[PDB]
Write a protein that binds this ligand. Structure first.
Ligand code: 2LL
Ligand code: K
Length: 125
């Protein structure tokens, strides 16, 4: 089979707000990870057709990526900062579920996760 539609990035039924935390998550946390040497494979949904991963969406039923997170931030999709942190954790955990220890892509996820945790540590109050 092919790819699912990507995660929703807009909900017109959801109220919106801007906050110091949500702004930092886009401008500091997401920007930093995005510009990292290992970011590209995480900048859009996993495309199982192009990567030839016919079991990807059999194993992964809650896909997430930084392209989606970026759009969710830009669209003010997130009301709670926790929702965004969750999405970043889902993204890493997926990489660890599907792939094997020591795989290039696992090593890249580990580095991005380490940096994420360094940046989240400085979330403003
Ligand atoms: C994340 C993730 N979780 O599970 C897998 C598998 C990946 C994964 C794992 C690896 C990923 C990748 C995603 N995206 C790319 C680069 C973008 C791309 C390139 C070609 C076709 C579609 C997208 N790569 C690198 C793919 N190249 C293929 C050619 O050999 C070197 C690596
Ligand atoms: K509103």
């Amino acid at each position: 089979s092919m790819n699912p539609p990507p995660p929703e990035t807009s909900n017109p039924n959801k109220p919106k707000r801007q906050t110091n935390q949500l702004q930092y998550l886009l401008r500091v946390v997401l920007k930093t990870l995005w510009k990292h040497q290992f970011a590209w494979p995480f900048q859009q949904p996993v495309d199982a057709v192009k990567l030839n991963l016919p079991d990807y969406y059999k194993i992964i039923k809650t896909p997430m990526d930084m392209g989606t997170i970026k759009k969710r931030l830009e669209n003010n999709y997130y009301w709670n900062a926790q929702e965004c942190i969750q999405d970043f954790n889902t993204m890493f955990t997926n990489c660890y579920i599907y792939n094997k220890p020591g795989d290039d892509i696992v090593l890249m996820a580990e580095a991005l996760e380490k940096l994420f945790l360094q940046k989240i540590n400085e979330l403003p109050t």
